[PDB]
Amino acid sequence: SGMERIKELMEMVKNSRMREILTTTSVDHMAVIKKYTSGRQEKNPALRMKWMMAMKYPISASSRIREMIPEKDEDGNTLWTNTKDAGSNRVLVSPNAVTWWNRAGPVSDVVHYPRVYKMYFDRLERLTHGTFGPVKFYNQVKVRKRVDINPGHKDLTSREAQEVIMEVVFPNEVGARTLSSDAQLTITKEKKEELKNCKISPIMVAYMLERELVRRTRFLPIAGATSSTYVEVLHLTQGTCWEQQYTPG
Amino acid sequence: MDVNPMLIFLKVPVQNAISTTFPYTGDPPYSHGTGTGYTMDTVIRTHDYSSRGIWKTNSETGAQQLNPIDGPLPEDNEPSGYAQTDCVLELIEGLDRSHPGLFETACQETIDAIQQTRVDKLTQGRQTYDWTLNRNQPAATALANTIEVFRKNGYKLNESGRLIDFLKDVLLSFENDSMEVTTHFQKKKRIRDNHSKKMITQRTIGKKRVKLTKKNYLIRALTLNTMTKDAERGKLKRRAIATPGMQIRGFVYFVELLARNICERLEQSGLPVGGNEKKAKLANVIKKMMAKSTDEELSYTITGDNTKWNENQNPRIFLAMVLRITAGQPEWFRDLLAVAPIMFSNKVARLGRGYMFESKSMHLRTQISAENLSDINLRYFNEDTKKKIEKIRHLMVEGTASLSPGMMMGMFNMLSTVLGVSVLNLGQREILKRTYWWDGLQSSDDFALIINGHFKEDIQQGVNHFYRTCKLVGINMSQKKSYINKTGTFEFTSFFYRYGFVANFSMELPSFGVAGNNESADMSIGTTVIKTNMINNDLGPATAQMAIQLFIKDYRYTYRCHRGDTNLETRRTKSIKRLWTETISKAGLLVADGGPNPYNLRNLHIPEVCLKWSLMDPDYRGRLCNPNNPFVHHMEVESTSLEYDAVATTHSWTPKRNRSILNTNQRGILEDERIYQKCCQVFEKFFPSSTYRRPIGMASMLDAMLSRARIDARIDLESGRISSQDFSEITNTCKAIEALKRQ
Amino acid sequence: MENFVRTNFNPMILERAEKTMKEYGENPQNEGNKFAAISTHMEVCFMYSDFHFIDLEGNTIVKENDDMLKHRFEIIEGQERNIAWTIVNSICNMTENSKPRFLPDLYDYKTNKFIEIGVTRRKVEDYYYEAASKLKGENVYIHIFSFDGEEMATDDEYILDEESRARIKTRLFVLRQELATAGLWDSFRQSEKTLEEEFSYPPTFQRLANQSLPPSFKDYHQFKAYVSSFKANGNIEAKLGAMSEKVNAQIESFDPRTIRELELPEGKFCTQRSKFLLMDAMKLSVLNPAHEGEGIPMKDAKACLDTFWGWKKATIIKKHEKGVNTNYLMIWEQLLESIKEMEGKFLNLKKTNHLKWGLGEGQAPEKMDFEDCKEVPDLFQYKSEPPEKRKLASWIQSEFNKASELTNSNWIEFDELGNDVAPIEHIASRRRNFFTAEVSQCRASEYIMKAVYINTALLNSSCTAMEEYQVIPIITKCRDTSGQRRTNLYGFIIKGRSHLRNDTDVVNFISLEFSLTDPRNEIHKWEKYCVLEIGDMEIRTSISTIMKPVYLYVRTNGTSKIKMKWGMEMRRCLLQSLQQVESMIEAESAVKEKDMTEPFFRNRENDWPIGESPQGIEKGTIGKVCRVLLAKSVFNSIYASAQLEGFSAESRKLLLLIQAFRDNLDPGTFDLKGLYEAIEECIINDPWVLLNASWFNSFLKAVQLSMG
RNA sequence: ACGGAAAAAA
RNA sequence: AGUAGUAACAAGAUUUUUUCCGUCUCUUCUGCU
Ligand SMILES: [Mg+2]
Ligand SMILES: [Mg+2]
C-alpha cells in the first residue's frame, strides 16, 4: 500500500537538486524552507476583493472541478476556464459555479458540519432555549477579569488536553511524552473509540478536539457572572448603562 | 447659525466625546518616494543631539563612530544624548534592590529558554534585510539564504538545530577573509509590447555568485536597512523605520526575551500587556497609588511623552544595563546577551534607494541609488538635500551611513521600558527621604507620572527631580506634549482615564467592513468584529444593529450576493434567482446564496451555517456541506487516490493570486520555492502531524522518510495489513534510494 | 584515543557513532574514549541484531548473508532521538506494550520485548544491578556485556543463540587485548564520568567589543569587571549638583482665559478640493425609472439626460487660469456627442489631443536606469517644497451648514435584521428607528452615497479598463417621502489611463458636474475649475418661473487606490456619529435609571450647543447633534489629509487641558508656546483644517465667556 | 504552529 | 494641467506588543431599489 509514496520519493530523489535538498536540509531546517518565498506577497486583500469580484473569474479551484461542474450554466454563464499555461492543476472559476453547486449539485447524505462544529451548535441550543428577563438601567461597574471563553474539560488543563489530542489524532508522532494523569487515559480511550473509521481530515479532528477539550481564557470587562456560558453572551447581557437578565439552557 | 461641533464640549466632557477628536474615517497619510531623506534626517538628528562626544575611527569597518556617553552634562532643555554610565548603573542597582530576586528569575528563565530555542524562531519577524541580496526579504527566506551562505563557507554549527549554535556561526563568520554569497542580477532587453507597440525592457532576474571582502561583509552584517512608515495616524510629517539583518536578529531576540521577563514582573511597566489586561493593570496601580496619598497631601499626574527617543538611546548604555542585570550569571550568558548592544553600537544605516532626478531637456526621470550620491556634484540637489548630504558625507562608508550613537525606531522596546521603570522606581518615599515622591507607568517611551507632595512647591521640586534624572540617562521629556494636572484624569498610550478608562470606538473604525478572504470567513469576521466592539469598545446596541445592517449591505455588494427577490441585476443574479425560486424554506439560504439576514444582538456569537441549520432544506444542506465539494482542498489518506472529506461549505473557496511584476521574468527565483514546496509536500506523506505541530529532529529529511517508510512497512507486515511482497518492494526501494544518496 | 577507533572499526560504525555524537554536540576529538565507547555499543548492538531472520513460518534462522526474509530485531540505537521515539511509538501502538520511559536499544519481534544492551568495563553484575536500579518500574529486557569475557542477561535466560554471543565475547576480548597493547585500557576503564554551555568571542568581535564602551575603558573585560564590581556611592545626586540650573521643567499654570487663539495662516483663500460638488450640485432625476436597462449606469445616465432638453451651446464662463480652457470645452462637446450616439453598456472615449491634455497623458518623463543616464548634464532633483499657506474662507462653513440639513429623500437604505427576541433588542430597534429617522435624510448621507458610488465605479473602471477612457456617470439612488424610488445624475467622470501598481499611484480623471451656482460670486472657491454654461432651466419656485442658467463645472482631478478604498467605506461615518450620540443617550440612562431615548428624541428641548450666531450660542436637539456629528465624520472622510491628522492629534492635548481646567484639576504645562507651534504647524492650506481651527477658537471664546 | 486584518508606541 | 507635499505619481519592477479571524492547494467583466 505504501509503495506509492515510496515511488514518489524515489522519483523525487532521482533529480539531483531535490536529492541535494533532501540530503542537506534537516527536519529542523524544513520549517526554515517551508515558509520560504521569493515572489511579492499580496497585501491589502479587502480592496482586492472589492475590485476582483467585478472580474468574471475570481476563484482558483482545483483541476478536478472540470469533471464536477459543466462549463456553461443554464443561462450561458461560463463557470470555469482554463489558465493560459502549458500545464494543469488549476482553473479560474466564476461564482456562478458556486451558486450552481449550491442549487443543482450532488446532494450528499453524510455531512460533517454538525459534528466538527458541535460547540457552536451547543451555543445555539443554549441561546434558543434561553430565558430573557427585564432590562435594568444603572451604571455598570465592569471589572476586567480573566474568564473562560471556552470551558474545556473539567478533568484536564490546557497542556493535558493538548497531550490527549496529540495521543488521539497523531499517536505515532508524540515523541517521548507520556500522559501522567489518569483521566487523560480515560478521555483518550473515549475519543479513540468515538473517532475510529473517521472519514474527515486528521487536522480537522484535532481542531474539533481542540475546541472541545482545551479551555481558553481572555481578559474581558465582566459585570455579573463569570461562568463560561455567560462570557459567550457578554455582548447580549450587558452594556454600559443597562443589564439584560438572561438565563441559558 | 454657524454650526460648530466643538461646542458639544460645552456640555459633554471631552473624554466622554473623545471619539469626535479622532478623524479615523478618511485615508491615513501615506509616504511617497524614498525613505532616504528621513534616514538622513535621523542620522543628522542622532549626531546633532550627541555632537559633544568623542569621535573615533572603527578598527574593523573604518567608520566614524561617536561616543557621547559619559560626556558633558546638558546645559539646556534641548534633547541630548550624553547619558552618564554611573547614573544608569545606580538606577538599575536600585531597581534590583527594590525588587528582590527579580533579575535572578528573569535571567534563569532566559537561561532555560536559550537552551530550548531553535533557529526558526528567527522566522517570526515581518521583513528582514538580506545581506546576501542587499534587499528587504521575509524572515524565512533571509534566514535560509544566511544559512546556505554560512554552510557553503564551512560554518556548519547551525546544523544542530539550536539558535545559539547559529549565533556562534554568526560570530565566527566575521573571520572569513572572502565570504562568497549568492546575489541577483538582471538582463534588460528592449522588446516591443504586443498591445501598445511601445518599447519596454524585459528584465530577467537571475542568480549570481560573487565574493565579498572582510570589511564589506562586516558592513553588510551590521547594516540596518531603512524604509518609510506608511498609514500612520496622528503625524503631519512621515518618518523612517528600520529593519536589521539576520546577524543582529538573533541576539536581539534573546535580549528582548530577558527584558520581557523583567517587564512582565514589574508593576509599573505597560509592556508587554495589551488590551483589557493592560487597562486592568493600569487601573490597579492607579487605585494603589491614589490610596497612598494621605488626607492632607497633594497628588499631580503628568501625561508625558518623550522627544526623540531612539536618537538618544545609546547602545552602550544598553550594554551597561545588560551587564548589570546579568550580574552573577555565567559569563557565556552575559556575552551572548551583550553581543546585541555591541552590534548596535557599531551599526550602519543603509540610506534607502536614492532619489529621482528629472532632466527637463531630455524629458527624463531616473532613480539614483543611495550609493551613487557621493560622486554627484551638489548643484543638482535641492537645498534641504544639499544640507543633509553635506552634513552626512563624512559618515558614508560603502554606501551606508555610520550610526554609532542612538538607536533606530522600535529596536529595544522592553529594555527601554526597563530603563524608564527604573527612573520611576527611583522616586519612592523611602529611597528619596524627601518631601516629594512619585510613581507611575511606563510604555516604550510614553509615560504617566504621579507626584505626591505636601505643597505645590514640592510638586515642582519633584517634577524637576524626575526631569533631571531622566536627563542624566538620555531620556528627554517633551515639554511641548507633556502636561500636568491633578490626579483623576490623564492619558497613556491613547488610553484616556477620567475616573476610569473611558471607551474609544473611533480607534476601532477601520476594523469594520468586509475583510476580503471569502464569503463565510468575511461573515464570521464581520459578526465577530461587531461583537468584540460591543464587548470591549462599548459599541451601543442600536449602533451595533446598524453596524450589522451596514456590514450586510457591504457584504451583499462585495460578493454580488443580494437577496433572491431583488430587482437588482449582477453577474450572478440568475443563478441566485433560480436557487431562490426552487427553495421551499428560503429562510435557510445563506447571505452568500441570496438568503435573508439572520443576525441580531442575541446571535452574534453563532456562525451563519450553524444559525440557519434548522431552517435549511435537506437538498440545500446536502449540496452546501457536501464532502465532495471541489472549491476547497482535500488531503490524501496516508499509509495509516482516496482523499479525506471536506467539512467547510462551498463558500470557503480560494481567490485568485496575482504575483507577476511588470516586465519581470522571475522563473529563476521561484524555482527554489517550487522545489522547497515539493519537498515539504512529499514530507507530509510520511509524517502527517508536520502541519499540526512543528516536527523536530537533527537527521535529514531523506533519512527520516526512509526510516518512517521501513518502520511503517514492518508494522503493516507484522500487523496483517500488507503482504510480504509489499514489504520486500518497500525495503528494496528504500535500499535503492540509499544507493542513490550514496553514489 | 581517536585513531584506534578509526582503525579497528567498520566505517559505517564510525558513521553511526559520529551521527550519535553530533546529536549531543560533542566532537570525537575532544572526547576520544567516549567515541570509542559509543562505537563499541553500536558494534555490539549490530552484532546482536544482524544475521537473525524470521522465515515465513516464524522460526528464527541464522543466515550468513541477506539471501525474501525479514529481520528478527528492530534496531533503535544509532538513529535520531525523534526517529527512535517514532519507532517506539509505532511498536507500542501495534501491541499493547506500555511505552519505555527511556530509549531502548533493540526490539525483538519474536518475544515482543525491548532490549537494552550496555557494554561496560567493570564487572557485569555491578552494571547489571546499576541498570536494574535505573530501569526499576518498566519491563525492559537487559543484556550487559563486558570486556572481561563474561555477560549477564535478565534472569540468566539468554534469548540470543550461543554462537552470536560467543562472537560478541570474542570481539570484546579482541578489543580488550587491542586496548591493552595500545596502552589505552585503564585510561578507557577510568574514562567514565553533563557539560555546560560556552560562548566565546572571536578576535574580530572582540575588537568590536573593545570599541563599544564608555570612553574611559579600552577593554570589554575591563568594563565588564567594572559593571560587575559597582556599588552606588550617590552618583545621581553628585551629577545633579553639577548639572546647570537651566535644565528644569518649570510648571506654568494653565488658564484658557489667558491663552491666545490659534493663528490661522495668511494668503489667498482656500480652494475647493473635494471629488464632487457638495452644496452646489444639481441633479437630473428620474422618478420610478422603468426604462429598458435600469441598473446599468450609462442607461440611467441617458434616461436622466432625457429629462432636460434645454441644451444651448456651451460657452466658457469661468476660465481655469493654469489650464487651456478650450480643451475643457472640446472635452465636454466630445463627451456629449459620444453620449448621444453609442451602444453597449460602457462608453470608452476616443483619445483625442484635448482629452489627452485633460487626462495628463505624456506628462510623465520617460523612466530610464542611471546606467543609461550617466552623461546627461541636466539631471536635477525633484522639488520637495512645502505647500503654500492659504487663508480661511466662508464657503467651507457654508458647506458644513448645508451638510447638516435635512432633505426630502431617504438617502441611505438599511438592510433587514433578524427577529427581535430580547427586550434589549426591542429597545435597540426603537433607538435605531429614531437614529434612522434623524440621520437618513441628511445631506451627509447623500454625500456618503455619492462618494461610495463614485469610488466604487471608479475603482471598477480603473481595474477592468486600464487603457480606455471610461465615462463614469455620477449616479445616486434615493427614495422620497412618498415612498417612491428616484435615480439622480450629477454629471460625469472621464477616467484616464489607470495602470496603477503602487498604492499611491494616481489615476487622473475629469469631473464634469452640473450645477446652478454662478462661479463669479465666490470665484476664489473655484480656482481649479473651468465652468461652462451649458443650458437654461425653468426653475419654478412658489411665485415665479425663472430661467436659471445651468452651469457645468469641469476640472481635472486625481485619486489613488487608497483614496478610492476609503471612499467606498464611508458608511462607517454613520457609526462614528451615532455611537457617540447613543453613548450620550446611554450616559443619562445611567443617571435617570430609565430608557432616555424617547425623552431625548420626542421632547425637543434644544439641550446641546451646536451653533454660533451673531446673537450668541445656539442649541439644538439630539437629532441635530447626530446630523452634525455625521457631517463632521463625512467631512473628515472627504477632506482627509495629513494636516487634519496632525491638527487633531495636537489640539486633542489643548482640549484635554481645557477639560482639566473645567474640572478644577489645576492644569499646568511645561511649554505652551511649543504646543501652539505644534498645532499651528499643521494649519497650512486644507479648508477643513482651517475650519476646525476657527471652530477651536470659537469654542475657546465660548469657554472664556462661560467663566464670567 | 502558518497566514491575514485593525490598533498602540517609538 | 492635475493629484499631492519635504517626494513621488503624471505607465513601463510590512521594525515591537496586544485583540480578532482563518487553516494543508498555480479574460471584456464595471448594475449597492
Ligand atoms: Mg503620552
Ligand atoms: Mg516621542
GROMACS .gro file of N, CA and C and ligand atoms in nm, chain B residues 303-305 446-447 491 493, ligand 1:
model
   22
  552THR      N    1   0.079   6.368   3.219
  552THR     CA    2   0.072   6.293   3.094
  552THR      C    3   0.197   6.329   3.015
  553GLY      N    4   0.287   6.233   2.996
  553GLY     CA    5   0.415   6.268   2.939
  553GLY      C    6   0.457   6.187   2.818
  554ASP      N    7   0.504   6.258   2.717
  554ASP     CA    8   0.570   6.198   2.602
  554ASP      C    9   0.716   6.238   2.604
  695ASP      N   10   0.614   5.633   2.610
  695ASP     CA   11   0.505   5.707   2.671
  695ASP      C   12   0.501   5.679   2.821
  696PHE      N   13   0.468   5.781   2.899
  696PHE     CA   14   0.463   5.759   3.043
  696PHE      C   15   0.354   5.844   3.107
  740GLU      N   16  -0.385   6.062   3.024
  740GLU     CA   17  -0.382   5.982   2.902
  740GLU      C   18  -0.252   5.902   2.898
  742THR      N   19  -0.081   5.597   2.634
  742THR     CA   20  -0.085   5.515   2.513
  742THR      C   21  -0.223   5.518   2.446
 1744MG      MG   22   0.158   6.016   2.625
   0.00000   0.00000   0.00000
